[PDB]
């Protein structure tokens, strides 16, 4: 029993911190940073004993006043590290008052490494055996703490003539292991692997991770090695459930609610889909989802791809700039074509721009010396003209010295919902090709007097 | 030409960054990070044009106001990757204002990969052909940059004038124009030059050069060396009397020795005590070797290497194969062992695997209620028990209530010495007093025992002796 919370970045003041009040699990990361005015008194009776697990990482940076984590997160047992801070699952950095970690229930970091650095009061580090918590401690970075530069006096719980705490080896020295003066490190028998064990040493169930309340019972785990469902740790999610966030099982209707919740009010949320029995944010590469079944299916030809231009306009002046639109089938914005030359161009432009089916704004072709046709825009069938070039033009062609074809109007259809046509200084382009464009595109009658030049279109060609 | 500087780690302020001002080579890594108050103006007039090479890795993280590296590190040509950050020789992470890399002289990354991640303004990535720089690009991790979307606006030299001044190419089906910024192409050499570099006129650098040279086919005119550096020259191997150091230069014994004795004297924890091995000066001895002390020289071990296990509070009880495992590799026990093994599988082999290298025990050895044991021969190499600590009653070797014990060691072959303390034997029904009396002879404990230390009636009583 417990609530699942999203990740949080808590800075400046402790105010939003109380949002963790009821979380047993953070589905995301937790960053606590940059609290310079906090002092011990602020933390004394501040505690989140419900928190068992974080799916990503825990980062603590420059938080003043805090001397231990033993009361904040007494029961945090697993950091999964599904996402990392670079490659770290735990970061403790310039915590200037921190005297111990005290994460006395931390059993497993499932992915990622540990970075503990520049904590000038920090002791009880030498007493942690991290090889029990992470598979590879080779990339841990634990330096410049009090422990290094000084004598720490890391006193573990212990009888006047033994030492209660378990002891493990460094290279050759056996060393007793603890988090605090009051708390040992839990160390299980090796047959238990990462599953945990009860206090009498009996192994938790193989679907458990870290710890359990009773031995060999997959309903008595503190956390799951694989997936969580209805009070039980399971190896995979059974039908009819889906794997979510790499740790819990959810039903179709849950996935469906995320999908619709998002697609509506659009922040940074995704419209969730189903793929390989997972409920995920978006279809993988080569897949798309257009059905009410939510199911990713392989693209019939090339995948749809909406490119929204936050600057409103993009100018294409090279193969390199064209490539920036590679794979796009819908442009939200306007395109300006200004290509003065290049290599294997008609083919290069068709490769990168040939899948665009719609442009919501305008299309402008200007000083594109190198172009003889616009037919590289193989699939362009709609310009909406929701945005227009001054003078209310949705298609505009100026000073293109070699242009002799727009599209082949015997095969290509192009619709232009709003706006006018502008054609000036296209000397190799016959007026009949322009007039065919007006007919095909539905722009007949929109053009005013000096919009299409009679004298500067086709004057260097033979026409009709 | 200038100095070899050591690895640096620059944080918070730009003040310490000027420590690089004369460095040609950074021997170590260069990390610049967590500069929250810097602004573009702090970097408009800042340049380190002498830096040519970094032997380890370059890492930039959260440096505010820095927009390009083209003025900072214009001549950086090689990152050798001798040590890496994880598996990366180049790391650009959460560089909030970086618009381009601009490392337009970077020709080679000799070992390791590139990680350029979460740089919200970062462009001029699609324009870089990394295959000229790294033999394998397969572990590169270049994600969550401005370049992932459709509005970088990358533009290479010549474009405004309709020209492609850069050596553009197609790699797979991807066009890559090969530039670093609007005004700097990526350098490319004829195929015959391989990774050696060439002059502006296309003429090959010498085969001992790496990346670039001031003149063709001369190993004293290299910008950086393929193999090692000595006395103004790039060389394939270090000659006598020099050692290979940090995988790029030749140094002498005395240099390696001075390093060793700075670190020994001052184990403040940012160093190693350097050693000689296979004509290299290195941080530590590899596995199988230990360091001959009088001349810094790694010498191999006669059999497995010495390993002293210091027991907590001077004792440990072995009552399973699992606990015995915790002592695998030990050749010296500092403390005392208690054996309490009642059952299990394949124990003589398992126990021999984990305890067979123990040569010496400094305290006492006690076997009691070890019902499963037929012999103590699993202690294959045990030759000394010192008795520096003893069991109550001044015993260094104590055997009580072991119902199947028939052998201690085979006293034909095995020699065991017991420096101090006495023997105790009671309730060993299958162990002949001959064996015990032999052990007394072998170990030098004959005449230490009092009358009840060894039982006449409860050692061997159930065996033919
Ligand atoms: C791995 O995971 C496991 C499983 O989650 C986890 O084990 C749990 O650990 C927690 C904490 O270690 C346990 O919770 C505590 O239980 C304490 C014992 O509670 C029982 O006895 C109480 C009497 O205690 C006094 O008297 C006895 C006898 O003389 C003495 O031994 C004690 O020292 C002490 O003086 C009693 O209060 C309690 O009875 C009440 O509650 C029960 C609920 O079962 C109810 O049935 C009764 O009617 C009655 O109302 C119970 O029977 C308990 O003392 C402790 O209390 C804490 O909070 C209070 C605030 O009220 C503080 O004052 C106090 O300082 C304590 O912090 C708390 O409830 C839990 O029992 C474990 N579960 C299991 C199955 O073992 C491990 O921690 C994880 N393992 C590792 C290594 O990390
Ligand atoms: C703390 O607790 C953990 C959990 O119990 C414990 O055990 C370790 O478990 C981890 C996590 O499960 C293990 O690491 C994984 O290993 C498997 C398999 O590795 C072997 O086989 C592969 C080939 O199949 C070899 O390459 C490899 O060398 C091994 O021989 C991998 O499947 C895992 O990698 C993938 O999955 C991860 C989890 O989803 C991904 O995050 C990761 O990026 C990899 O992605 C790939 O698989 C996905 C499908 O699942 C797919 O979606 C991706 O696109 C991609 O294809 C991972 O390496 C580890 O082996 C366990 N270690 C041991 C000793 O058993 C820890 O031991 C414990 N810590 C301690 C000290 O107790
Ligand atoms: C950038 O510039 C470089 C030139 O500087 C250029 O060439 C490449 O140079 C690198 C570095 O020299 C070469 O990488 C080495 O390759 C050798 C050859 O391996 C042979 O044998 C093995 C084993 O069966 C096979 O895998 C292989 O097929 C070969 O037949 C390796 O020996 C090297 O590995 C050792 O050195 C590494 C780097 O120090 C170590 O990290 C590694 O563990 C190895 O160490 C062991 O051997 C060392 C002796 O070499 C010894 O010092 C250690 O103690 C230890 O025992 C290394 O991988 C690479 O092959 C060159 N590549 C090419 C194409 O020639 C790059 O090409 C240039 N970049 C670009 C894009 O141009
Ligand atoms: C598919 O799953 C949804 C969502 O289930 C919820 O989230 C999952 C990830 C798990 O953590 C679930 O344990 C969790 O319930 C189901 O909807 C949920 O159903 C439960 C049970 O009916 C609802 O709780 C109840 O609400 C009533 C009346 O308000 C109370 O009197 C009950 O005591 C009980 O608390 C819960 O409100 C509801 N949640 C949502 C978001 O709708 C859904 O039933 C399931 N659908 C199918 C087809 O199986
Ligand atoms: C070990 O090598 C070092 C470094 O020498 C330099 O690098 C090598 C790889 C080669 O390329 C060499 O050709 C090159 O010189 C030698 O360093 C030198 O050490 C001497 C002795 O300490 C320094 O001492 C001098 O002492 C007096 C003090 O009164 C001053 O007058 C001098 O200014 C100087 O301090 C000398 O400066 C130093 N040279 C350099 C360039 O670093 C080292 O001698 C050599 N050791 C042995 C035993 O051969
Ligand atoms: C490859 O390496 C060559 C050779 O070092 C580089 O060319 C050299 O560039 C340096 C500047 O980095 C030039 O130095 C300058 O000299 C003048 C002296 O009049 C002075 O104004 C400057 O302060 C500076 O010191 C040097 O002239 C030049 N030499 C040659 C052979 O052209 C070159 O940049 C490297 N890279 C490439 C891509 O070729
Ligand atoms: C092209 O996009 C514009 C701008 O859309 C804005 O940013 C988007 C990412 C999207 O999330 C919008 O809601 C943002 O407003 C669209 O114009 C807006 O349309 C939305 C309806 O979704 C409406 O709320 C606004 O009033 C519109 N006006 C503006 C300037 O924001 C436009 O509809 C898109 N065109 C096509 C054909 O998709
Ligand atoms: C050229 O296409 C137009 C418009 O087609 C519509 O809009 C496109 C963007 C595309 O998504 C199509 O599915 C649409 O039909 C044709 O005009 C349409 O004609 C049909 C039948 O007469 C009618 O149902 C549409 O509503 C019309 N819309 C408009 C804007 O007139 C036009 O006929 C096509 N040219 C030819 C000869 O096929
Ligand atoms: C066995 O070991 C003890 C303790 O050794 C010290 O602590 C270890 C963890 C390790 O770091 C050793 O190098 C330490 O010396 C020995 O007692 C010490 O003996 C040394 C000489 O070896 C002496 O100079 C110290 O003063 C002693 N320190 C203490 C804690 O008393 C003990 O002598 C060793 N017994 C053997 C194998 O002869
Ligand atoms: C059995 O060993 C003893 C003791 O040997 C010494 O201690 C061992 C742990 C090992 O380190 C040996 O190299 C040591 O010499 C032998 O008696 C010793 O004999 C040597 C050589 O003659 C002499 O220098 C010692 O002082 C002697 N020590 C004692 C206490 O007697 C004995 O000879 C060995 N038996 C066999 C099979 O050779
Ligand atoms: C880089 O080298 C220059 C050498 O010019 C150093 O500047 C000199 O510093 C010394 C030592 O105090 C002064 O005596 C000289 O007068 C300086 N020379 C000039 C011309 O400025 C500088 O110290 C070096 N920088 C670093 C970081 O070591
Ligand atoms: C925690 O749980 C209580 C009990 O329902 C609730 O009223 C309170 O508002 C919760 N805290 C938060 C931050 O949601
Ligand atoms: C351009 O369009 C706007 C509305 O979208 C309209 O009010 C205006 O009349 C147009 N300008 C011209 C030149 O007619
Ligand atoms: C045991 O040995 C010690 C040290 O030599 C000695 O002082 C003591 O008298 C001996 N007596 C016993 C316990 O048999
Ligand atoms: C950085 O330099 C400032 C002065 O600019 C100084 O206050 C401080 O000691 C330095 N900060 C650290 C910790 O590097």
JSON list of N, CA and C in Angstrom, two decimals, chain A residues 29-51:
[
{"chain": "A", "resi": 29, "resn": "UNK", "atom": "N", "xyz": [13.11, 10.77, -11.16]},
{"chain": "A", "resi": 29, "resn": "UNK", "atom": "CA", "xyz": [14.22, 11.08, -10.27]},
{"chain": "A", "resi": 29, "resn": "UNK", "atom": "C", "xyz": [13.84, 12.02, -9.12]},
{"chain": "A", "resi": 30, "resn": "UNK", "atom": "N", "xyz": [14.76, 12.18, -8.19]},
{"chain": "A", "resi": 30, "resn": "UNK", "atom": "CA", "xyz": [14.61, 13.14, -7.13]},
{"chain": "A", "resi": 30, "resn": "UNK", "atom": "C", "xyz": [15.91, 13.92, -7.05]},
{"chain": "A", "resi": 31, "resn": "UNK", "atom": "N", "xyz": [15.84, 15.21, -7.34]},
{"chain": "A", "resi": 31, "resn": "UNK", "atom": "CA", "xyz": [16.92, 16.17, -7.12]},
{"chain": "A", "resi": 31, "resn": "UNK", "atom": "C", "xyz": [16.49, 17.10, -5.98]},
{"chain": "A", "resi": 32, "resn": "UNK", "atom": "N", "xyz": [17.35, 17.22, -4.98]},
{"chain": "A", "resi": 32, "resn": "UNK", "atom": "CA", "xyz": [17.23, 18.25, -3.95]},
{"chain": "A", "resi": 32, "resn": "UNK", "atom": "C", "xyz": [18.53, 19.06, -3.97]},
{"chain": "A", "resi": 33, "resn": "UNK", "atom": "N", "xyz": [18.41, 20.36, -4.25]},
{"chain": "A", "resi": 33, "resn": "UNK", "atom": "CA", "xyz": [19.58, 21.19, -4.44]},
{"chain": "A", "resi": 33, "resn": "UNK", "atom": "C", "xyz": [19.41, 22.68, -4.05]},
{"chain": "A", "resi": 34, "resn": "UNK", "atom": "N", "xyz": [20.53, 23.34, -3.77]},
{"chain": "A", "resi": 34, "resn": "UNK", "atom": "CA", "xyz": [20.62, 24.82, -3.66]},
{"chain": "A", "resi": 34, "resn": "UNK", "atom": "C", "xyz": [19.67, 25.38, -2.61]},
{"chain": "A", "resi": 35, "resn": "UNK", "atom": "N", "xyz": [19.88, 24.92, -1.39]},
{"chain": "A", "resi": 35, "resn": "UNK", "atom": "CA", "xyz": [19.18, 25.42, -0.23]},
{"chain": "A", "resi": 35, "resn": "UNK", "atom": "C", "xyz": [20.26, 25.92, 0.70]},
{"chain": "A", "resi": 36, "resn": "UNK", "atom": "N", "xyz": [20.50, 27.22, 0.60]},
{"chain": "A", "resi": 36, "resn": "UNK", "atom": "CA", "xyz": [21.57, 27.86, 1.35]},
{"chain": "A", "resi": 36, "resn": "UNK", "atom": "C", "xyz": [21.18, 28.42, 2.72]},
{"chain": "A", "resi": 37, "resn": "UNK", "atom": "N", "xyz": [19.89, 28.64, 2.96]},
{"chain": "A", "resi": 37, "resn": "UNK", "atom": "CA", "xyz": [19.43, 29.24, 4.22]},
{"chain": "A", "resi": 37, "resn": "UNK", "atom": "C", "xyz": [18.93, 28.20, 5.22]},
{"chain": "A", "resi": 38, "resn": "UNK", "atom": "N", "xyz": [18.73, 26.96, 4.78]},
{"chain": "A", "resi": 38, "resn": "UNK", "atom": "CA", "xyz": [18.32, 25.85, 5.68]},
{"chain": "A", "resi": 38, "resn": "UNK", "atom": "C", "xyz": [19.36, 25.51, 6.74]},
{"chain": "A", "resi": 39, "resn": "UNK", "atom": "N", "xyz": [18.86, 25.10, 7.91]},
{"chain": "A", "resi": 39, "resn": "UNK", "atom": "CA", "xyz": [19.67, 24.71, 9.08]},
{"chain": "A", "resi": 39, "resn": "UNK", "atom": "C", "xyz": [19.07, 23.45, 9.73]},
{"chain": "A", "resi": 40, "resn": "UNK", "atom": "N", "xyz": [19.83, 22.75, 10.59]},
{"chain": "A", "resi": 40, "resn": "UNK", "atom": "CA", "xyz": [19.39, 21.48, 11.17]},
{"chain": "A", "resi": 40, "resn": "UNK", "atom": "C", "xyz": [17.94, 21.47, 11.67]},
{"chain": "A", "resi": 41, "resn": "UNK", "atom": "N", "xyz": [17.61, 22.45, 12.48]},
{"chain": "A", "resi": 41, "resn": "UNK", "atom": "CA", "xyz": [16.26, 22.62, 12.99]},
{"chain": "A", "resi": 41, "resn": "UNK", "atom": "C", "xyz": [15.17, 22.41, 11.94]},
{"chain": "A", "resi": 42, "resn": "UNK", "atom": "N", "xyz": [15.40, 22.88, 10.72]},
{"chain": "A", "resi": 42, "resn": "UNK", "atom": "CA", "xyz": [14.43, 22.71, 9.61]},
{"chain": "A", "resi": 42, "resn": "UNK", "atom": "C", "xyz": [14.16, 21.25, 9.22]},
{"chain": "A", "resi": 43, "resn": "UNK", "atom": "N", "xyz": [15.15, 20.38, 9.47]},
{"chain": "A", "resi": 43, "resn": "UNK", "atom": "CA", "xyz": [15.10, 18.97, 9.08]},
{"chain": "A", "resi": 43, "resn": "UNK", "atom": "C", "xyz": [14.76, 18.00, 10.23]},
{"chain": "A", "resi": 44, "resn": "UNK", "atom": "N", "xyz": [14.99, 18.42, 11.47]},
{"chain": "A", "resi": 44, "resn": "UNK", "atom": "CA", "xyz": [14.85, 17.54, 12.67]},
{"chain": "A", "resi": 44, "resn": "UNK", "atom": "C", "xyz": [13.64, 16.59, 12.67]},
{"chain": "A", "resi": 45, "resn": "UNK", "atom": "N", "xyz": [12.44, 17.14, 12.47]},
{"chain": "A", "resi": 45, "resn": "UNK", "atom": "CA", "xyz": [11.22, 16.30, 12.40]},
{"chain": "A", "resi": 45, "resn": "UNK", "atom": "C", "xyz": [10.67, 16.21, 10.97]},
{"chain": "A", "resi": 46, "resn": "UNK", "atom": "N", "xyz": [11.57, 16.06, 10.00]},
{"chain": "A", "resi": 46, "resn": "UNK", "atom": "CA", "xyz": [11.21, 15.96, 8.58]},
{"chain": "A", "resi": 46, "resn": "UNK", "atom": "C", "xyz": [11.61, 14.57, 8.12]},
{"chain": "A", "resi": 47, "resn": "UNK", "atom": "N", "xyz": [10.62, 13.77, 7.72]},
{"chain": "A", "resi": 47, "resn": "UNK", "atom": "CA", "xyz": [10.80, 12.34, 7.51]},
{"chain": "A", "resi": 47, "resn": "UNK", "atom": "C", "xyz": [9.86, 11.81, 6.46]},
{"chain": "A", "resi": 48, "resn": "UNK", "atom": "N", "xyz": [10.35, 10.94, 5.56]},
{"chain": "A", "resi": 48, "resn": "UNK", "atom": "CA", "xyz": [9.48, 10.30, 4.55]},
{"chain": "A", "resi": 48, "resn": "UNK", "atom": "C", "xyz": [9.63, 8.78, 4.58]},
{"chain": "A", "resi": 49, "resn": "UNK", "atom": "N", "xyz": [9.11, 8.17, 5.65]},
{"chain": "A", "resi": 49, "resn": "UNK", "atom": "CA", "xyz": [9.31, 6.73, 5.89]},
{"chain": "A", "resi": 49, "resn": "UNK", "atom": "C", "xyz": [8.57, 5.82, 4.89]},
{"chain": "A", "resi": 50, "resn": "UNK", "atom": "N", "xyz": [7.59, 6.35, 4.16]},
{"chain": "A", "resi": 50, "resn": "UNK", "atom": "CA", "xyz": [6.91, 5.59, 3.12]},
{"chain": "A", "resi": 50, "resn": "UNK", "atom": "C", "xyz": [7.78, 5.28, 1.87]},
{"chain": "A", "resi": 51, "resn": "UNK", "atom": "N", "xyz": [8.79, 6.11, 1.60]},
{"chain": "A", "resi": 51, "resn": "UNK", "atom": "CA", "xyz": [9.58, 5.96, 0.38]},
{"chain": "A", "resi": 51, "resn": "UNK", "atom": "C", "xyz": [10.51, 4.75, 0.44]}
]
